[PDB]
Amino acid sequence: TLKSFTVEKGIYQTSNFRVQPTESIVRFPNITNLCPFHEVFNATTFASVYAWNRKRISNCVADYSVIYNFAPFFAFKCYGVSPTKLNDLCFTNVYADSFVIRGNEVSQIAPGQTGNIADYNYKLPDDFTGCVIAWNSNKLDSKPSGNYNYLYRLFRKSKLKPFERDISTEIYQAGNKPCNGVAGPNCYSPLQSYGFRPTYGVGHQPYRVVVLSFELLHAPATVCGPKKSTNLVKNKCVNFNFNGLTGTGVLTESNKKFLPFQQFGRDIADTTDAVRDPQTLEILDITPCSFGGVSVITPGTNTSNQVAVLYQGVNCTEVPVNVFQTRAGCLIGAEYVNNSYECDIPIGAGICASYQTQSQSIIAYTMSLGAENSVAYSNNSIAIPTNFTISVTTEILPVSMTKTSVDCTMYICGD
Amino acid sequence: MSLGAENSVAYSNNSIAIPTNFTISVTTEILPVSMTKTSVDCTMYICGDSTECSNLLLQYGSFCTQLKRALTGIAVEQDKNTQEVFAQVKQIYKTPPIKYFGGFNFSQILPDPSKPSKRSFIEDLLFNKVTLADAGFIKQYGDCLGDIAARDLICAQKFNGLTVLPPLLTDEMIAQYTSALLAGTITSGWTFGAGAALQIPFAMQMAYRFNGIGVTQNVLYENQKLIANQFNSAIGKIQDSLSSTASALGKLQDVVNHNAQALNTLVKQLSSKFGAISSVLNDILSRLDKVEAEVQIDRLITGRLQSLQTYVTQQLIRAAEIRASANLAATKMSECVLGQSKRVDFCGKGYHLMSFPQSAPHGVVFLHVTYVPAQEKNFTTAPAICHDGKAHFPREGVFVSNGTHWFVTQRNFYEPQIITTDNTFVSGNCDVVIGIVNNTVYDPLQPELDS
Amino acid sequence: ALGKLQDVVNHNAQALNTLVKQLSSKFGAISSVLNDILSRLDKVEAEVQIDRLITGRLQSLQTYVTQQLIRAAEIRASANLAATKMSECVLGQSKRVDFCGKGYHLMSFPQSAPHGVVFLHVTYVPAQEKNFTTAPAICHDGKAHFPREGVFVSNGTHWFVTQRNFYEPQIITTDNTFVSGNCDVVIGIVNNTVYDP
Amino acid sequence: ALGKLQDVVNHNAQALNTLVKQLSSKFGAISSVLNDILSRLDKVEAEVQ
Ligand SMILES: *[C@@H]1O[C@H](CO)[C@@H](O)[C@H](O)[C@H]1NC(C)=O
Ligand SMILES: *[C@@H]1O[C@H](CO)[C@@H](O)[C@H](O)[C@H]1NC(C)=O
Ligand SMILES: *[C@@H]1O[C@H](CO)[C@@H](O)[C@H](O)[C@H]1NC(C)=O
Ligand SMILES: *[C@@H]1O[C@H](CO)[C@@H](O)[C@H](O)[C@H]1NC(C)=O
Ligand SMILES: *[C@@H]1O[C@H](CO)[C@@H](O)[C@H](O)[C@H]1NC(C)=O
Ligand SMILES: *[C@@H]1O[C@H](CO)[C@@H](O)[C@H](O)[C@H]1NC(C)=O
Ligand SMILES: *[C@@H]1O[C@H](CO)[C@@H](O)[C@H](O)[C@H]1NC(C)=O
Numbered sequence A: 001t002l003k004s005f006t007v008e009k010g011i012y013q014t015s016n017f018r019v020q021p022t023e024s025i026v027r028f029p030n031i032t033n034l035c036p037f038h039e040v041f042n043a044t045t046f047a048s049v050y051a052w053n054r055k056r057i058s059n060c061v062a063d064y065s066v067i068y069n070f071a072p073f074f075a076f077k078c079y080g081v082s083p084t085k086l087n088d089l090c091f092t093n094v095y096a097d098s099f100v101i102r103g104n105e106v107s108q109i110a111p112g113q114t115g116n117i118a119d120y121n122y123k124l125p126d127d128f129t130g131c132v133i134a135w136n137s138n139k140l141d142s143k144p145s146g147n148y149n150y151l152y153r154l155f156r157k158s159k160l161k162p163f164e165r166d167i168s169t170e171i172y173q174a175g176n177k178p179c180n181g182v183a184g185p186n187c188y189s190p191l192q193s194y195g196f197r198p199t200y201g202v203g204h205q206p207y208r209v210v211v212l213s214f215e216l217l218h219a220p221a222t223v224c225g226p227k228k229s230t231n232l233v234k235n236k237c238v239n240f241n242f243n244g245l246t247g248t249g250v251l252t253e254s255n256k257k258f259l260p261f262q263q264f265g266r267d268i269a270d271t272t273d274a275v276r277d278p279q280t281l282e283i284l285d286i287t288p289c290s291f292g293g294v295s296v297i298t299p300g301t302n303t304s305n306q307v308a309v310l311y312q313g314v315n316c317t318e319v320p321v322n323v324f325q326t327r328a329g330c331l332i333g334a335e336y337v338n339n340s341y342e343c344d345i346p347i348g349a350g351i352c353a354s355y356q357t358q359s360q361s362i363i364a365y366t367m368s369l370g371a372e373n374s375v376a377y378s379n380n381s382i383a384i385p386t387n388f389t390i391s392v393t394t395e396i397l398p399v400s401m402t403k404t405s406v407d408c409t410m411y412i413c414g415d
Numbered sequence B: 001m002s003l004g005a006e007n008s009v010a011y012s013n014n015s016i017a018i019p020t021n022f023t024i025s026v027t028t029e030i031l032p033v034s035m036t037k038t039s040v041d042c043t044m045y046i047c048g049d050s051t052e053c054s055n056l057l058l059q060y061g062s063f064c065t066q067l068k069r070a071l072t073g074i075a076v077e078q079d080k081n082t083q084e085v086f087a088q089v090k091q092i093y094k095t096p097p098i099k100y101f102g103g104f105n106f107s108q109i110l111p112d113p114s115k116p117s118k119r120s121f122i123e124d125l126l127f128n129k130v131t132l133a134d135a136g137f138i139k140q141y142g143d144c145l146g147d148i149a150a151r152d153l154i155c156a157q158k159f160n161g162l163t164v165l166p167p168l169l170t171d172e173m174i175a176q177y178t179s180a181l182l183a184g185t186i187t188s189g190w191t192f193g194a195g196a197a198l199q200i201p202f203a204m205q206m207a208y209r210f211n212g213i214g215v216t217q218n219v220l221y222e223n224q225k226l227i228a229n230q231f232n233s234a235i236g237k238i239q240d241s242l243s244s245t246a247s248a249l250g251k252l253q254d255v256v257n258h259n260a261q262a263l264n265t266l267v268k269q270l271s272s273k274f275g276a277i278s279s280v281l282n283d284i285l286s287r288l289d290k291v292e293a294e295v296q297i298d299r300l301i302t303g304r305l306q307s308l309q310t311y312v313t314q315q316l317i318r319a320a321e322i323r324a325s326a327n328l329a330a331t332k333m334s335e336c337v338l339g340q341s342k343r344v345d346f347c348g349k350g351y352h353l354m355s356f357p358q359s360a361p362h363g364v365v366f367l368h369v370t371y372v373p374a375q376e377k378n379f380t381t382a383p384a385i386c387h388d389g390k391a392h393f394p395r396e397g398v399f400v401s402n403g404t405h406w407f408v409t410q411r412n413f414y415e416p417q418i419i420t421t422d423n424t425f426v427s428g429n430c431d432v433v434i435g436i437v438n439n440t441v442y443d444p445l446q447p448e449l450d451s
Numbered sequence C: 001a002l003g004k005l006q007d008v009v010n011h012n013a014q015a016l017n018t019l020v021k022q023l024s025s026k027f028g029a030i031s032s033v034l035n036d037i038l039s040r041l042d043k044v045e046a047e048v049q050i051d052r053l054i055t056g057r058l059q060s061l062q063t064y065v066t067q068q069l070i071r072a073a074e075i076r077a078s079a080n081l082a083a084t085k086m087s088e089c090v091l092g093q094s095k096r097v098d099f100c101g102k103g104y105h106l107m108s109f110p111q112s113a114p115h116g117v118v119f120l121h122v123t124y125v126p127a128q129e130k131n132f133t134t135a136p137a138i139c140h141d142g143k144a145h146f147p148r149e150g151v152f153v154s155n156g157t158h159w160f161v162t163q164r165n166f167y168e169p170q171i172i173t174t175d176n177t178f179v180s181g182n183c184d185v186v187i188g189i190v191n192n193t194v195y196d197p
Numbered sequence D: 001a002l003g004k005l006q007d008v009v010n011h012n013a014q015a016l017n018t019l020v021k022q023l024s025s026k027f028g029a030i031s032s033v034l035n036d037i038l039s040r041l042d043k044v045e046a047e048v049q
């Protein structure tokens, strides 16, 4: 730690100890349902662009390898989550949206993006989890006469909120003159068809999108991955997996008064204190495993190679990964003695240590403030000195330090 | 705002005012000495037992070694401050069993052995008035394990890598140092700070203290009961003023509250995102792949490193201010308590007599005993007196007149005396001193020679 | 005994050593050597790595400057104290307790040192005490005699007046005593004769 | 003679002058004007700047 080969007399802080976790419990809700991914993933057609479909998936065990099995999609291109990390993460609710798109629309539908499609047809929220799966479906949407059953929306009075659907065949007027059943006198139909053709250009080929957007809430989680449940442990430093909330601590039985709608307890530093069990209605309190600093008490290596160890702030009945309990932790390697000397190596609240002859050893003691004195006071007694001494002492005071000068261009860059 | 009352002091070129009575005043000065020693671990704070975060934190160099060195230097300096202020005495003197010091009542500042921590009455009042935050210097992991009611703030400060180290000197040892200084002051005087302790009766010591401020020593011996009663009433007034109002100890309370809110801010800064998607490293490690989680962990590392550097810089500036206050408290212990100070407005307002230390949480309390003149009286004065063509000047005194007869008296008290050649000296003619008056000067040798 | 000046040397060496050592860190880039980033990558990616190195080196240099400023404030406080001690201990005599050494101050001699100054404080310390019996005043002919300067002492039979800091007894005389009041006021006044020259 | 109070004035002037002039720097971005970044770019890139 000191980057040397000889140390001096003193107390040095070397590292920090920690009680390692022993077991690994995974608490997990038991559900036998299988999520309808295969059932409503493979379809012969999708809905319109302006009028898509929403599918609610809940309360089931989820599998995420079916995207490779069913659709020949190019890339996941996902925000906020890894495709291979979905196997462990337990979510709140899965939302499935399936609708066809045009070629110049894969990059158009994104959080924090605008255009013409995102204003009316399909709008994604700016902060969300889950993602968009897209591929090529040019031959999957090529009738010999072309596709016009899909409709397109381009006119509205104002903007449209994310995750919303528009179903209308009204008339919009760009002026104060109403039309009411006539199209063309300064008013046109907001509903427009699609020019999907087998002989069309490459820039507007028909594509397809299945959305699998998830959400992260403090709601009671229903849909999870496939995992296994493990029975409870108590008063042990153990890693836990309570509904995907991982960590490490000691799961003491809680004393609290949790209301029936409250599951998670919260810390001031944003961590968790108490967690509701996913298999019963018992609240259990989390406490972190024991830790602290470690200090090595040594004299100089020119004197001896004996050391003492101070584990700071622990009632060391749980020391490991002469034993004396101290106010400042506990001291291993030093013997407590009922004497009083001056302080050589300062340890804690009144305790010092030193290298003493009485075979050599490292001793620990409470330090002495000085010799006890009791000057004889009386109401008619005085003490007057008859001689004197002249003494010369020494006082040392720093005055100045080193003057330095640094330039940025030589230090940061160097020509 | 008003600056104060308006006064038009009456100045004339032959008019003087001399006090006739005094009051004994006990004031109180409160000075901080030391502050809380803390140690912070980087790997628990920034990362918290995450291996990937530690591997990314290893690329940032040696920020954490110098943060650890700065906090260790502050923690050593606090113990140096307490040792410099209080441990100014070589031996632990103790009071004789007879509690008679010329009528002065020192029962409120001398300790009593009834309670385990042998502290006095006023020290107990000062210790109860400063409410502690109950920080991590007390071992509390046994209490952090036992979840009773709700989670404590101190446990939450402990759980994120912040540790509070106890001071080297316990409060009983500070109380023993204060008792030794009090016993040396009461029994010896200023002699215990210049070598060995030399006993002297308290009345003769107070006569020496009055001789220090330009008043003769017969003023004490002729008014011993009055001065004793004034000191006892002043000590009782300090006790009642402490037991009534609790706003006088605001400096040590500020010392406690600043450290409490600094640790609270450092704990609350862990909830911030700093542009990432979550403030929890486990969620980023479980949700994302390698590279994007590395980006989010690097953003969290930058934010938490910046907050830790801000905390350490504020701690260094606070420790410099605390060290300056501790140097001032050490100088006041050396000069007021171990001697008698001639510096104006140092060691209390008025002419200083003696001071008494009292230990307070994170500081010290001085009770300055001073001399304040009370009842003055207008007089007519002159610089010199002409007699037989010779100008007479007072040796140590001032010439005053009641209207008909001329007297010489000391400056700080009214004690008129007959003008004699013993208390005056001759210098020059009568034609050079502006304002000289005509009066006779007694010569004691002529009636001794005639009789 | 000279650990203060040695600490002043050691801190200034260690800060510069840490500032040199901080040039070896990557700070999230791919190399700590700038020419390798220049020679390996294109324009944009080398600009990204260079900006990471610039941010890290600027942060380390700012921390060095702030620590040096706080150290300079401490050094300036110590220099002001040394200047005051030079003006008061060396250029004059000080009546302040525990200033200019422990004891009754007589002299002081400055000595130069690396990055500092050394004072040799010469003081007066009383050595050999002796118990005595004392009184605040002397009652003689109904008049109380107080000492002018000094203190009344008794070796058991006779009464003397002596100075406070040295045992030099003298015969009690009206030249070294003054009269104030009668014997019925002072608590502890004793009966003794005062010589008339 | 009065250089110390003049320095007390000058330091407080030049610190605020540096604080005002620091708003002109780009700090690695493409513009020091916040409205230009808000008007020229999309949401994510303007968030980066
Ligand atoms: C889950 O477990 C609980 C108790 O362990 C049981 O009451 C419940 O019926 C189970 N649910 C299913 C779907 O099996
Ligand atoms: C979808 O279902 C149809 C009819 O059940 C089937 O012909 C087709 O092969 C299925 N698609 C895939 C990718 O399995
Ligand atoms: C904690 O330490 C104290 C100090 O010795 C001891 O009395 C107490 O039993 C300890 N608590 C335990 C071991 O639970
Ligand atoms: C002075 O002390 C003696 C013995 O110590 C005691 O008898 C006497 O009463 C004391 N004087 C006064 C005035 O109390
Ligand atoms: C002294 O004071 C009186 C009254 O104020 C004044 O008349 C006189 O001029 C003063 N003396 C001198 C020398 O000015
Ligand atoms: C004053 O002294 C007497 C004894 O001389 C003692 O009984 C009394 O308690 C003292 N006063 C106070 C307020 O303690
Ligand atoms: C002294 O004289 C002045 C002027 O006549 C007067 O104002 C003052 O009240 C008198 N008394 C005292 C005690 O100053």
Ligand SMILES: *[C@@H]1O[C@H](CO)[C@@H](O)[C@H](O)[C@H]1NC(C)=O
Binding pocket: B386, B438
């Ligand atoms: C004082 O007395 C001398 C001689 O006795 C005389 O010349 C002088 O005028 C007197 N001064 C006053 C102010 O009366």
Ligand SMILES: *[C@@H]1O[C@H](CO)[C@@H](O)[C@H](O)[C@H]1NC(C)=O
Binding pocket: A376, A383, C129, C130, C131
């Ligand atoms: C004075 O008397 C006390 C008690 O009678 C004794 O302890 C001490 O040694 C004597 N001498 C001196 C020099 O104090």
Ligand SMILES: *[C@@H]1O[C@H](CO)[C@@H](O)[C@H](O)[C@H]1NC(C)=O
Binding pocket: C139, C190, C191
């Ligand atoms: C001192 O002498 C006076 C008379 O001269 C006498 O009344 C008094 O009692 C004496 N005091 C002592 C203590 O002997």
